[PDB]
Ligand binder design. Structure first.
Ligand SMILES: Cc1cnc(CNS(=O)(=O)C[C@@H](C)c2ccccc2)o1
Ligand SMILES: [Zn+2]
Length: 139
């Protein structure tokens, strides 16, 4: 589990969105596994605006933050999970690291701010849904 709290927005994995998220929806995209809802309180996270390929992510199944190198956001075939059939996921970045289903929502960050959230896992890989192109999160 986990979210990004920037401005009056809450960014979560679409597959983990709650009824309150869907009842206060700003934007959602199944192909990216992302959903954004509105919040009453202002958040403290800041979004990175860059093309970094190194950063640090939080892994809840290890209670640890790991430094990783990751690929640029791309269209990748992701195997079936409990939440999606095997399909192409867009704006996804991969790194070598540990990721179990419940690790979704952990933040990946670089020197400029939050880069994305954990979205995929298995086989010693971790995949992150990028948010750096969503410029509207800043206003
Ligand atoms: C990059 C890639 C291709 N095929 C896959 C694996 N697909 S999945 O990540 O949707 C599987 C899911 C159960 C999960 C496991 C662990 C963590 C977060 C989700 O990943
Ligand atoms: Zn950066």
């Amino acid at each position: 589990s986990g979210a990004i709290y920037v401005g009056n927005y809450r960014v979560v994995n679409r597959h983990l969105a709650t009824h309150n998220d869907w009842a206060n929806l700003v934007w959602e995209d199944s192909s990216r596994d992302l959903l954004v809802s509105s919040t009453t309180a202002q958040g403290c996270d800041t979004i990175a605006r860059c093309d970094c390929q190194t950063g640090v992510y939080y892994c809840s199944s290890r209670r640890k933050h790991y430094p990783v190198s990751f690929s640029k956001p791309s269209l990748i075939f992701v195997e079936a999970s409990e939440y999606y059939p095997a399909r192409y996921q867009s704006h996804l970045m991969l790194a070598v690291g540990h990721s179990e289903p419940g690790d979704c929502g952990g933040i990946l960050r670089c020197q400029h701010g939050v880069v994305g959230i954990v979205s995929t896992g298995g086989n010693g890989l971790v995949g992150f849904a990028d948010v750096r192109d969503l410029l509207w999160l800043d206003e």
